[PDB]
Each structure stands twice: as structure tokens, then as C-alpha cells.
Design a protein around this ligand. Sequence first.
Ligand SMILES: Nc1ncnc2c1ncn2[C@@H]1O[C@H](COP(=O)(O)OP(=O)(O)OC[C@H]2O[C@H](O)[C@H](O)[C@@H]2O)[C@@H](O)[C@H]1O
Length: 160
Amino acid sequence: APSYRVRRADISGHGEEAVVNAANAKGTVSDGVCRAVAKKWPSSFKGAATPVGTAKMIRADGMTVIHAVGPNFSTVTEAEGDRELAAAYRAVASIISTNNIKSVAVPLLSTGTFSGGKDRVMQSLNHLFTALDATDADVVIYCRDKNWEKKIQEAIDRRT
Ligand SMILES: Nc1ncnc2c1ncn2[C@@H]1O[C@H](COP(=O)(O)OP(=O)(O)OC[C@H]2O[C@H](O)[C@H](O)[C@@H]2O)[C@@H](O)[C@H]1O
């Protein structure tokens, strides 16, 4: 069974074996989690392009980086977005399992640039739990907002 912790910190300072980048399909660098990952592990972006709802892994700069492309909710219906967000997290979980990754730093996919201006913390978190429950990884969830930290902690606790 996996364990779940939440850290309010820059994901680039994570102490885990692997990190999930909240990526775009083209594998370009832009504002958010993507900028911090690009600065700390710059060569992790070579050939990282991958379709929406998929993940692509690389070892570079002494780190395992998992480029997960959540949907942009401005570009899909709510139902299509929900399906694609679930897919992105399952793709991440499959990479964790197949590669025997013991611990992973994960941000909440599609909750920033890709949120279509809605609060999607719980939508994204619940897909994170569903997908990563299929692993035995130690998952550390990273956010920047104190109010999110508390909501995520409450969500973790409720599963006990
Ligand atoms: N350094 C960080 N550490 C931890 N959490 C962070 C960091 N930066 C942002 N967050 C939080 O992590 C969450 C994810 O926000 P986002 O990074 O927008 O991911 P998306 O999937 O919504 O959009 C990805 C696009 O954004 C980029 O342009 C990429 O190039 C893509 O184009 C938010 O709640 C943030 O508060």
C-alpha cells in the first residue's frame, strides 16, 4: 500500500526518488511547476513531448522526471477533461510501478494554468489517490497554497 504526505514547498527541493512535472504536450518550459523542474533538471526536457492524458519519463541530471500532461480545461468539455485528468494520473502510476520507483513528488495536475480558472484541487487530488493507490510508492504531494495544504491534509486523514 502507498503512503501520502503533503508539503507546502517548491517541488524542485523534493527529497523523493522521482518528480512529476505538470507538463504541456509540446514539452516547452512555461510558468509554474514546469519552470522549477526546468531550472533544477534542465536536460529532463529533451524529447519530453507527449500527448494530453499521457506521461513520459526520463533520467537526467541525477533525477527521474515524469512529464505528465493533464488536460487544459479551457480546451475540453468538463467530462472529457475529467477522463483525460484520470488518464494522466494512471499513466504516472504505471511509470511508478513498472520502474520500481519507491517515492515520488507530485503536484496537482490541471489546477493552475490548465484549470480553466476553476478550483480543481479536490477533482485533481481524488484522481491522484485513485491512480497512485495502484502503486506501493511513498507519494509526497506538493502545493504552494497554505489553504490547499490543509484541504489535502484533511483529504489524506479522512482515508484513516
Ligand atoms: N514549483 C512548484 N512547486 C510546487 N507546486 C507548484 C510549483 N509551481 C506551481 N505549483 C502548483 O502546482 C499546481 C500545478 O500548476 P501548473 O504548474 O500551472 O500545472 P497545470 O497542470 O495546471 O498546467 C501545466 C502548464 O503549466 C505550465 O505552463 C506547464 O508548462 C504547462 O503548460 C498548481 O496548484 C500550483 O499552485
